[PDB]
Design a protein around this ligand. Structure first.
Ligand SMILES: Cc1ccc(-n2[nH]c(C(C)(C)C)c/c2=N\C(=O)Nc2cc(COc3cccnc3)n[nH]2)cc1
Length: 259
């Protein structure tokens, strides 16, 4: 990837290390590719430069259909990490914009796609820590991709977190399972924020006493049941993502049959 082939267009957001720009990359074939170009302040420590660059070193290895894609890296100053840009943007806002036209089958599809990504992470004992619809991008109506690009960060959102994460800052694959079911609640609620009726400080109290997020109107009952299993207080009683894939695939086929 040569710098002359990357054209920057507008600020996408601020990341931890520097601004992130929307851009266009023209590849060796000559096609134009929408990219998110991540930058790093020049005055950062060697450690922070290493951390910044480590994203590209890691992500080069990820090629899952439901994980975001690293396009490339320009190592020379100014050092740029070039991620694929998904013009549809975040799933939460996508759902908000499209509530009147989306079918439940499609909501279950997205849940299963993310579950498959997470089962892959579980297979290598990696944890996400920030599973939420803001970290999922829509590649197309038929395809979502999981990212990890929130300003906290290879491995707080209180209203998404397991009780052990809230109480002890403990984060395991089992706590990701809890967070993933919250993400599913967001999907099935067309982007509503979980516990929007509470302040962060009230959340643990509610969980300790046995209260949970109510079933979204459109959520199939069997899917709500799975959600509630992911919200078992005891991390040992939550399913593994690997087995959840099987459970979700069953819900998808039940939903596809009735459609
Ligand atoms: C050091 C380090 C840092 C991050 C990671 N991980 N880990 C993961 C897992 C595999 C999911 C866990 C993803 C990841 N990186 C990213 O998601 N990067 C990314 C995405 C974006 C936003 O892109 C957009 C936004 C809007 C529209 N279009 C595109 N910015 N940066 C790994 C190592």
């Amino acid at each position: 990837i040569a710098r002359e082939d990357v054209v920057l267009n507008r600020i996408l957001g601020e990341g931890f290390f520097g601004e992130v720009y929307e851009g266009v990359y023209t590849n060796h074939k000559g096609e134009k590719i929408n990219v998110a170009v991540k930058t790093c302040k020049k005055d950062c420590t060697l450690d922070n430069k290493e951390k910044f660059m480590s994203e590209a070193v890691i992500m080069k290895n990820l090629d899952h259909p439901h994980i975001v894609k690293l396009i490339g890296i320009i190592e020379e100053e100014p050092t740029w990490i070039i991620m694929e840009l998904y013009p549809y943007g975040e799933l939460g806002h996508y759902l908000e914009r499209n509530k009147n036209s989306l079918k439940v089958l499609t909501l279950v599809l997205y849940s299963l796609q993310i579950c498959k990504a997470m089962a892959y992470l579980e297979s290598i004992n990696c944890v996400h820590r920030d599973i939420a619809v803001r970290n999922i991008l829509v590649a197309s109506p038929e395809c979502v991709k999981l990212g990890d690009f929130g300003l906290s960060r290879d491995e707080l959102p209180i209203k998404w977190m397991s009780p052990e994460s809230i109480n002890f800052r403990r984060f395991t694959t089992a706590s990701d399972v809890w967070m993933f079911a919250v993400c599913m609640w967001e999907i099935l609620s067309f982007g509503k924020q979980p516990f929007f009726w509470l302040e962060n400080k009230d959340v643990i109290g509610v969980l300790e006493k046995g209260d949970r997020l109510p079933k979204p109107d459109l959520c199939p009952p069997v899917l709500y049941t799975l959600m509630t299993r992911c919200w078992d207080y005891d991390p040992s009683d939550r399913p593994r993502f690997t087995e959840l894939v099987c459970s979700l695939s069953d819900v998808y086929q039940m939903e596809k049959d009735i459609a």
